[PDB]
Structure 1
Amino acid sequence: IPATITERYKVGRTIAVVKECVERSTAREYALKIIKEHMIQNEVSILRRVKHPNIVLLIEEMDVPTELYLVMELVKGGDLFDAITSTNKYTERDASGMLYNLASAIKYLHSLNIVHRDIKPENLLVYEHSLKLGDFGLATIVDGPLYTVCGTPTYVAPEIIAETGYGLKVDIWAAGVITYILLCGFPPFRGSQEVLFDQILMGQVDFPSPYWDNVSDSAKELITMMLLVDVDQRFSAVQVLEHPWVN
């Protein structure tokens, strides 16, 4: 039961519920998410603040006593997880363009002291004409050191596992894990569940042969600095955005 929404939008098929939406004024297609709670209240507060071309935007929200309505950008290219599956490996020029998108989104979030802490291929949508980061369910504002161990372990930084306290740079660690997966088809820390944790805490970035023989040393160098165990020495999003591989 929308009302003010029906005057501005034309709801279509269905994909909490998700349905296609069409903006009357622009003829642009949008997604409408119908949600029937402090953690949900927190997530929408970030959605209102974050506006970047490499982030899935929240166009508007209507809050009613029974349910909650969100109109958001619709991306038809699917998530990076599915795209990685069919192609397996990407060219260096394609992958650096994606890192440009992800690092741009990360830099913007960190200028707001927001850590996403759920940066994985399923949450990166692909746009035909780009990447967009989404799902801020784990996102938060870094008032101090964080200690909760959340996120899909393959992309989780060693300080999260160590439980000694983490901050904004865990998003950079995930960005290096993704870029690594983009260039060779497999993650830098693999495990066999406990084995995965010792690989991350050791933090040894390797570039096996034959897979990494063609990839340039500029890419290996950047990936190394993104995947540093020393958080202070680990790259910031600005340092990623100024690297020659990204430009």
Structure 2
Amino acid sequence: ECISVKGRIYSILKQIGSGGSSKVFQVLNEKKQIYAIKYVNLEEADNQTLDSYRNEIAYLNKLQQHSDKIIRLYDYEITDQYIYMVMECGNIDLNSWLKKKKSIDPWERKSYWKNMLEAVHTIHQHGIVHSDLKPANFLIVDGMLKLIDFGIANQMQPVGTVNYMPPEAIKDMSKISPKSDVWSLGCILYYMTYGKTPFQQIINQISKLHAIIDPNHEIEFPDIPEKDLQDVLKCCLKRDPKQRISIPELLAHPYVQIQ
């Protein structure tokens, strides 16, 4: 099955994901190179979803310059009826990768953490708070993690996980701030160190959301060889966002600096 973007032809290999309005295809160009193409059908799209898609493509373009931990955008086509975005194709997404590992190498964990901090730092410096980060938002490319989206448009699905959801996102039911992204990052790092997310054991979604915002529900932090890692996790998972560690503080933390 064939796709045309700005007169260039691509062969579809498989469907990576689907959204409401959109689909993402692993694709083959004329020179036998692999890409990922996102297609957005705008024919049935209110001004809201239209503007979210315009905002996403504008931010994705702007951010090309500012970090290589943001997904590469090679080309795009926008029309009143559709958007195509020709992007790099990753090896595998973080969620699938974590799912198949029994354990994570401390060095690999640290290096992926640095990638995530950098990517999220760079969107924050442009005024974007993702506010729904989770392992599926990161992608492995060249042994390096890249953030693939910004929380701006409706995101890709290959019921929803709420294991990474920040307290103040639950309280919007706007207190969402850059600290919200720190919480979610902490939850990913927590999974990478202890093998479970902090509230994985609580099966019922509503019960879990209550637990996420309840300060009397202690999160467990078993002692581990790496004391700096343990402190990162505790600082990320503070329920008061005022007391929760910031991205610049995480970038100067011993965990990422003392090697």
TM range (shorter): 0.7 to 0.9
Q: What TM-score do the two structures reach when normalised by structure 1?
A: 0.82
Which amino acid is 1:154 matched to? N
3-state SS of 1:189 partner: coil
Q: 1:139 to 1:168 in 2, by over 3 A?
A: farther
Q: Is the 8 A contact 2:186 2:237 kept in 1?
A: yes
Relative to the length of structure 2, the TM-score reads 0.78
The runs of at least 4 consecutive aligned structure 1 residues that moved more than 6 Å come to none
Task: Say if 2:104 is the partner of 1:90.
Answer: yes
For the residues of structure 1 that align with 2:139 and 2:243, how far apart are their CA atoms?
30
After superposition, what is the alpha-carbon deviation per residue over 1:7-50, rounded to whole angstroms, capped at 9, x for unaligned? xxx522342452414486xx754222232222222222221222
| Higher mean displacement: 176-185 or 52-61 | 52-61
Matches within 5 A, 1:6-17: 6=8, 11-15=10-14, 16-17=22-23
Match of 1:147 in 2: none
**Separation (CA, whole Å) in 1 of partners of 2:229 and 2:5:** 51
What residue number does 1:160 align with? 169
Name the aligned partner's letter for residue 127 of structure 1: V
The letter of the residue matching 1:195 is S
Distance (whole Å) between structure 1 residues aligned to residue 229 and residue 100 of structure 2: 23
SS of equivalent residue, structure 1 residue 155: coil
Distance 2:252 2:178 in 1: 18
- Equivalent residue for 1:4? 6
Q: Quote the Cα distance in structure 2 between the aligned partners of 1:3 and 1:53.
A: 24
Residue 31 in 1 paired to residue 36 in 2? yes
How much is the aligned-residue C-alpha RMSD, in angstroms?
2.4
Q: Which residue of 2 aligns with 1:216?
A: 226
Does the residue aligned with 2:39 lie in a helix, a strand or coil?
Answer: strand
SS at match of 1:118: coil
> Aligned to 2:149, what secondary structure does the other structure show?
coil
Amino acid of the residue matched to residue 234 of structure 2?
T
Partner deviation per Cα, 1:74-118 (whole Å, 9 max, x = no partner): 112x11111111113212221111110000011111111111122
Q: What do the CA deviations read for 1:158-206 (whole angstroms, capped 9, x no partner)?
A: 1221236221211111000000000111011232322212221135331
Q: Residue type matched to 1:220 in 2?
A: Q
2:184 counterpart (165, 169, 174): 174
* Separation of aligned partners in 1, 2:208 and 2:220: 15
Distance 1:95 1:220 in 2: 13
Partner Cα distance (1:103, 1:126) in 2: 15
Q: Partners of 1:166 and 1:113 in 2: how far apart? A: 12
Residues 239, 64 of structure 1: CA spacing in aligned structure 2 closer, same or farther, 3 A cutoff? same
| Mapped partners of 2:111, 2:7: distance in 1 | 36
Change (3 A) 1:68 1:242: same
Structure 1 stretch displaced more, 119-128 or 94-103:
119-128
> Residue 195 in 1 paired to residue 207 in 2?
yes
User: Which amino acid in 1 is paired with 2:137?
Assistant: N
Match of 1:57 among 69, 72, 81: 72
Q: Which runs of 5+ in 1 are unaligned?
A: 141-150
1:246 is aligned to 2:246: no
| Aligned length in residues | 227
- Contact kept in structure 2, 1:189 and 1:196, CA below 8 Å: yes
Cα distance in 1, alignment partners of residues 192 and 179 from structure 2:
20
Contact 1:95/1:182 (CA < 8 Å) preserved in 2? Answer: yes
Report matched runs for 1:132-147 at 5 Å.
132-138=146-152
Letter in 2 for 1:62: E
Shift of 1:129: 4.0
Moved more, 161-170 or 218-227: 161-170
